[PDB]
Design a protein around this ligand. Sequence first.
Ligand SMILES: c1ccc(-c2ccncc2)cc1
Length: 113
Amino acid sequence: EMQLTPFLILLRKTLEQLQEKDTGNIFSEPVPLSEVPDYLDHIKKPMDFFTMKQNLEAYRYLNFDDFEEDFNLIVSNCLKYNAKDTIFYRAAVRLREQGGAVLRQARRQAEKM
Ligand SMILES: c1ccc(-c2ccncc2)cc1
């Protein structure tokens, strides 16, 4: 129960803050199946920040949970596909940690709306 426009502005800013935590930009775009042809064998719903931006603008995020669910998919897909001893797996752990703080603050701002 709030205005749509300020909420989407908040999600756009939050998405930007999450992208800033991904300093290697390993989650900015979909995982390239050209270089990872087996990626879809067990990853049933790939996700990335560019796709999240498309979903945001397509009005697919009308509450904080749905936005946060796709961010969590970025993290969980990466933990699932990659071995624990890789840079990619550790990057997903770090994103989960740093992104979670971004999300908790942004959700507190949405709840004031
Ligand atoms: C090249 C680029 C990205 C990746 C990748 C990134 C994150 N999760 C799985 C694969 C692998 C090879």
